[PDB]
């Protein structure tokens, strides 16, 4: 028998390939180069963990920012109210508080914390940030600092201690304490804040409250190392053109 099959011919719309954008939650028709044919993957065990790429784990790690000094013997800058350090608060840290390595005619290489690389891969981002400050000192130094978080400010023009005490802030006393974390709030009229490399949504600043003391037996300089990691609620939004490239080849054609 060779019965005829008269069933009508369906329409169909030719296209050269599958989705270029889709990365998840789908199948991908493809021509695999295997001896086998079928859904096949490379073997694993405990010798080889699972993939470590879950964002919250990468961005939980602190990266380091430019360190800076108190000079306790400095009579000028060591006073009530003098502001030591400050910067706009957003995941991509500001280009001037990162450690840079500059080359002649090449690109400048920035050391960005892991939150700042991840946040360059996405278009919007939101949630709290952790700033862990790390003081080089010994039991004999002492001071107090007021670290305030000012929502809706770009730069320090109108910023003094007497004003900064009107926002969310934390008073910390470095009396035999070498590290503290300041989890800054996230206060913004919008739900996702766009990337920066714009303005940052807020600002952070650090004022001497009680000046630094020390003696003739102890070093007079206290170095501070600021470090930044994402909080527990921090989230990224829409994949975009990465703001940063690799430094493997830093040659550039203007």
């Amino acid at each position: 028998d060779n019965p005829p099959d008269p069933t009508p011919a369906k329409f169909f719309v030719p296209i050269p390939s599958h989705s270029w954008a889709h990365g998840t939650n789908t199948s991908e028709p493809t021509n695999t180069l295997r001896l086998d044919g079928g859904v096949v993957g490379v073997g694993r065990s405990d010798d080889i963990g699972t993939s470590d790429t879950a964002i919250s784990g990468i961005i939980g790690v602190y990266g380091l920012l430019k360190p800076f000094d108190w000079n306790a013997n400095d009579t000028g800058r060591n006073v009530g109210g003098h502001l030591l350090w400050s910067m706009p608060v957003h995941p991509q840290v500001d280009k001037d508080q990162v450690i840079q390595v500059m080359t002649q005619s090449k690109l400048t290489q920035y050391y960005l914390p892991p939150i700042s690389v991840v946040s360059s891969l996405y278009a919007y981002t939101r949630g709290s940030i952790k700033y862990k400050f790390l003081f080089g000192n010994n039991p004999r130094h002492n001071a107090r600092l007021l670290v305030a978080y000012i929502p809706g400010i770009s730069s320090d023009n109108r910023l003094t201690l007497e004003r900064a005490r009107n926002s969310a802030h934390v008073v910390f006393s470095l009396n035999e304490v070498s590290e503290f974390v300041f989890t800054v709030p996230y206060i913004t009229d919008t739900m996702w804040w766009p990337r920066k490399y714009f303005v940052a949504p807020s600002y952070i600043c650090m004022f001497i409250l009680n000046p630094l003391v020390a003696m003739e037996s102890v070093p007079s300089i206290v170095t501070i190392v600021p470090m930044i990691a994402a909080g527990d609620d921090f989230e990224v939004a829409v994949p975009a053109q990465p703001a940063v490239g690799l430094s493997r080849n830093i040659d550039v054609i203007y």
């Binding site: 954008a21 919008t190 739900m191 766009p194 994949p239 975009a240």
Partner: protein, 95 residues
Amino acid sequence: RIVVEGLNSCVWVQHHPDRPSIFSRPIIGRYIAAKDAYRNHAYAAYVQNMSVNRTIEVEVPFYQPGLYGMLNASDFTGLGDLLIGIEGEQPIPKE
């Protein structure tokens, strides 16, 4: 539905969900700005040979921080930009 013909080579489309929104006309060719010139990496994009098929039909998502997008804007309010471009210098017909 983008119907780009003339040309008959591999053409491409790409959505920049947040680079808005300065003007009410499109911008042709040499007048598009330095960083919107070539393709970008990791923006949602699509590619098609005008030899296989002449019509690209894509659906643009709504990616914004805000609650709404604004209809009847005046001139991040809208759907961003849509970039259309050739994939590597097929010679262009003299008209």
